Design a protein around this ligand. Structure first.
Ligand SMILES: *[C@@H]1O[C@H](CO)[C@@H](O)[C@H](O)[C@H]1NC(C)=O
Ligand SMILES: [Ca+2]
Length: 496
């Protein structure tokens, strides 16, 4: 459950949010594999409801109609093709599994689905699976409205409808089997693991029963006995009766306190400063590192649309965002998930963005292809943060220092900190309103290193900042608070 099943030396996965299968297949071969990325989290590959009001929102993909591999991302052939090609280049595929529910109970019956499948929410009829009224929790939920009304009641959180979404009776073997049939079809296709959507809304025991029905990974690509990597999406912040620790027996869990706290520290909200990150990790009350899936922002919270609210840093806050991602990728805690988004027309009103529902770039509902510009950036409104030099190079930094201990910490009691990873890497940050100019102990062997944030090592030369480490492991760093990117990172592989 707990191992990502990535190729040795690859330590991160990237969420290619709403990307088409054909574009992901290409990205695996032309960029992801060459650049050392471990895998890709894909959007739900099963048929969902086609919502036209609002026009094809991103969240319509979280309202299942059947388990047919047919969505705006592509069909089953394109899906298998993507998995095969990515696997052949050493890049894993992790599926977003929406198994807690089907579509909204108030959705009109008909064939308004991504594959034409007929469904009738009102009568609990999903013939394409098939599911009927006996497969939902309508009779089990005890709330007056049938929806989740109070999160202080761990029971209704699990048995009632999350904002109207028809709740599956996951204790029934039939339901468990239809879910497992779907997941085993994907495992046999070649996927390496799953992101279990809305895990807080399912009983830990029901999840386990389903996982026990799962096959071992495809023996054509994975060694015998490989189990799918499982990470459960559980938003567990302040005290609530549900704890993410209740799910440790099934696999990893998303640590949403991670991005929320990193965001407030870097934004310097209410007294927090980077010097406090000295004991970042369990020391901050986070789950154990070997059970954590971490990230700065996620598709569901980068819109103020989730846990962390306004503290969350996203591509919109580019300068601070790159620094947060850099800190995460450099720090040893957890398994890292990198976000890759698309631009939407944010339109704030009374503190809230009214266009937080806007789906991916499209032409009359047809998702636009990801076009690569000559400078390696993307067109068609895809942000492609995973291609930003600062993020991509830190993804590599993590691979390079993998296994190395957290050492040589330094801080000025405010917002200028630094630390290294064994004798393989070192990173320095300046988030104060004044310049940083100091000689630090890096723990790195003597030599000239290319700063990978401002540039790259291009065959015996650096295109950006160059750092000189003396025989005793010291090196001078200068970062003005006016720098484009207020941080420097050097590692074993950027050494001249
Ligand atoms: C490094 O760049 C300089 C020119 O700036 C050039 O003289 C030298 O040959 C380069 N070294 C390599 C190995 O390309
Ligand atoms: Ca439920």
């Amino acid at each position: 459950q707990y191992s990502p099943n990535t190729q040795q030396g690859r330590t991160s996965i990237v969420h290619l949010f709403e990307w088409r299968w054909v574009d992901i297949a290409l990205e695996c071969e032309r960029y992801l594999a060459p650049k050392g990325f471990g895998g890709v989290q894909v959007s739900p590959p099963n048929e969902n409801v086609a919502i036209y009001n609002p026009f094809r929102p991103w969240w319509e993909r979280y309202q299942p109609v059947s388990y047919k591999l047919c969505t705006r991302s592509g069909n089953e052939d394109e899906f298998r093709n993507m998995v095969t090609r990515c696997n052949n280049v050493g890049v894993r595929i992790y599926v977003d599994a929406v198994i807690n529910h089907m579509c909204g109970n108030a959705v009109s019956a008909g064939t308004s689905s991504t594959c034409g499948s007929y469904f009738n929410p009102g009568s609990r009829d999903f013939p394409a699976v098939p599911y009927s009224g006996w497969d939902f929790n309508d009779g089990k939920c005890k709330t007056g409205s049938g929806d989740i009304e109070n999160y202080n009641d761990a029971t209704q959180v699990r048995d009632c409808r999350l904002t109207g979404l028809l709740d599956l009776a996951l204790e029934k073997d039939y339901v468990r089997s239809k879910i497992a049939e779907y997941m085993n079809h994907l495992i046999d296709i070649g996927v390496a693991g799953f992101r279990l959507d809305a895990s807080k809304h399912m009983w830990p025991g029901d999840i386990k029963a389903i996982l026990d029905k799962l096959h071992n990974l495809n023996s054509n690509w994975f060694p015998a006995g490989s189990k799918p990597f499982i990470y459960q999406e559980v938003i567990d912040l302040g005290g609530e009766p549900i704890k993410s620790s209740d799910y440790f027996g099934n696999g990893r869990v998303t640590e949403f306190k991670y991005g929320a706290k990193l965001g407030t520290v870097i934004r310097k909200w209410n007294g927090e400063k980077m010097s406090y990150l000295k004991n970042w990790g369990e020391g901050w009350g986070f789950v154990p590192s070997d059970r954590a899936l971490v990230f700065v922002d996620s598709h569901d919270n980068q819109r103020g649309h989730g846990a962390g609210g306004a503290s969350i840093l996203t591509f919109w806050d580019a300068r601070l965002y790159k620094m947060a991602v850099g800190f995460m990728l450099a720090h040893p805690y957890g398994f890292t998930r990198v976000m890759s988004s698309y631009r939407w027309p944010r339109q704030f009103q009374n503190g809230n963005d009214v266009n937080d529902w806007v789906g991916p770039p499209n032409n009359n509902g047809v998702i636009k292809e990801v076009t690569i510009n000559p400078d390696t950036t993307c067109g068609n409104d895809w942000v492609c943060e995973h291609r930003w030099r600062q993020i991509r190079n830190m993804v590599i930094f993590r691979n390079v220092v993998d296994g190395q201990p957290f050492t040589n910490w330094y801080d000025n009691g405010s917002n200028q900190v630094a630390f290294g990873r064994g004798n393989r890497g070192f990173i320095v940050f300046n988030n104060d309103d004044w310049s940083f100019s100091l000689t630090l102990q890096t723990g790195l062997p003597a030599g000239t290193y290319c700063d990978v944030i401002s540039g790259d090592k291009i065959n015996g030369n650096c295109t950006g900042i160059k750092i000189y480490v003396s025989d005793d492991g010291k090196a001078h760093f200068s970062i003005s608070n006016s720098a484009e990117d207020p941080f420097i990172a050097i590692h074993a592989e950027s050494k001249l």
